Amino acid sequence: ANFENFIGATEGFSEIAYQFTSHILTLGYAVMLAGLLYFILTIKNVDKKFQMSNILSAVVMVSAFLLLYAQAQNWTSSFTFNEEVGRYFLDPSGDLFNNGYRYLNWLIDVPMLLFQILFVVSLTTSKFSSVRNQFWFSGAMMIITGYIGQFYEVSNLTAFLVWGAISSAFFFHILWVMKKVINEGKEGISPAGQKILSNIWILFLISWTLYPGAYLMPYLTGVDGFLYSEDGVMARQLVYTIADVSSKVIYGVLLGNLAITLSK
Ligand SMILES: *C\C=C(C)/C=C/C=C(C)/C=C/C1=C(C)CCCC1(C)C
């Protein structure tokens, strides 16, 4: 159904590819647990008016920890070692590699990552509810559309790219609203706070952009290329993990540093 199931059923995964993926996916949820503690223990550092950011971050941590731990458990329990060939192949008796776990974490997270910023920075000419509604509708849509096309990653590479194209449309609209929010939030805050808001915008752009990259990591070097193999799966899962810590944990950390900066 997905690229990881196909490669695991045809050429198979080497011992290092399988060992490396389960390791990156373990490090993935382990830092979410660490992030959950950081946000809980640091709430006393920010004034009451900003604590909504810590709360939102902590709930994202929980969602990330639970679902990413299941994604890892699903990966390891999805392949078995064939001593006769020397590689890990799809196990007909297991439940297969399912991306729905990662895609459900995204759906729960988008509304909270985009909402929490509006609890630290202030808008000027924009309306609070107008920005929030645009963030929730388009953030959900980019995800349900990215999940619809992900079903044809193998079955139909045309629908894979069209759905990913529509999903991107909603994605670039978010970057647009996120840019006005950071421009308005900069007004009336000290130069120190502005610098952090600039770092946040840059981290938001790269981190969220990493996702579509992994969505295409295999079909990047062609239909018979270096990444159209077990290496493309190692790079996709790796890219997801980097974007996962950056867009969820690092992003939330920077917001807290901003809130800390604002109370002076
Ligand atoms: C886990 C938390 C968040 C905010 C995840 C965000 C993920 C993306 C922005 C993914 C975007 C996609 C794009 C742009 C196109 C293909 C489908 C994706 C969902 C991977």
Residue numbers in the entry: 8 to 271
Quote the passages of the study that discuss this structure, keeping the authors' original sentences.
Here, we describe a multi-reservoir, high viscosity extruder as a step towards automation of sample delivery at XFELs. After commissioning the device with lysozyme crystals, we collected time-resolved data using crystals of a membrane-bound, light-driven sodium pump. Static data were also collected from the soluble protein tubulin that was soaked with a series of small molecule drugs. In two commissioning beamtimes at the SwissFEL Alvra endstation, we validated the general performance of the multi-reservoir extruder and determined 13 structures overall.
Second, we utilise the device in a time-resolved serial femtosecond crystallography (TR-SFX) experiment by collecting structural snapshots of the light-driven sodium pump Krokinobacter eikastus rhodopsin 2 (KR2). Xtrapol848 was used to calculate q-weighted difference maps Folight–Fodark and corresponding extrapolated maps from these data. These maps depicted the structural changes 1 μs after retinal photoactivation. C Difference electron density maps (FoLight–FoDark) shown at sigma level of 3.0 depicting the structural changes of and around the retinal 1 μs after photoactivation.
